[PDB]
Amino acid sequence: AQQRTMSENLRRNLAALEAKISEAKTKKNMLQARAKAAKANAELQQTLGGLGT
Amino acid sequence: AQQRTMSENLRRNLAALEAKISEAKTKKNMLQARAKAAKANAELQQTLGGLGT
Numbered sequence: 001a002q003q004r005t006m007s008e009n010l011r012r013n014l015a016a017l018e019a020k021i022s023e024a025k026t027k028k029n030m031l032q033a034r035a036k037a038a039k040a041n042a043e044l045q046q047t048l049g050g051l052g053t
Numbered sequence: 054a055q056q057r058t059m060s061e062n063l064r065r066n067l068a069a070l071e072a073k074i075s076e077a078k079t080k081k082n083m084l085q086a087r088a089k090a091a092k093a094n095a096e097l098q099q100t101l102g103g104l105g106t
């Protein structure tokens with residue numbers, strides 16, 4: 001009974017940990033994509049910008 | 054829902070980027086052609102020009 005309820009709490013912490021990691025992965029990747037969009041936009045600002053070469 | 058609407062915005066930026074690049078390619082090539090036309094015209098001004106050799 002003691003080992004079971006201890007384990008149940010540990011299991012709950014495990015579920016929470018997994019959910020947070022899943023969220024972090026999702027966020028990480030969208031940020032890489034958003035960073036790349038910004039980089040691409042900057043290069044278009046260069047080419048379709050002012051005067052230069 | 055959150056990831057979807059984020060992605061939709063990112064997708065819109067992607068479409069815009071692609072359109073601008075397409076325009077830049079079109080413009081680039083016509084300019085090379087116009088530059089070549091100018092060069093050719095200059096050589097005809099030379100040959101069918103004034104006096105020389």
Ligand SMILES: Nc1ncnc2c1ncn2[C@@H]1O[C@H](COP(=O)(O)OP(=O)(O)O)[C@@H](O)[C@H]1O
Pocket residue numbers: 045046049050051052
């Ligand atoms: N004569 C120019 N006019 C505009 N931009 C130039 C010129 N020469 C170089 N640039 C480059 O283009 C960018 C123009 O600055 P930016 O702040 O992007 O324009 P804006 O303030 O109109 O958005 C600069 O980062 C600069 O490196």
Ligand SMILES: Nc1ncnc2c1ncn2[C@@H]1O[C@H](COP(=O)(O)OP(=O)(O)O)[C@@H](O)[C@H]1O
Pocket residue numbers: 098099102103104105
């Ligand atoms: N005696 C000449 N008469 C006219 N052009 C000459 C003569 N000798 C050399 N040229 C060459 O031909 C060009 C004539 O100048 P250009 O401004 O093209 O003529 P226009 O002013 O009549 O259009 C010059 O770039 C020059 O290099």
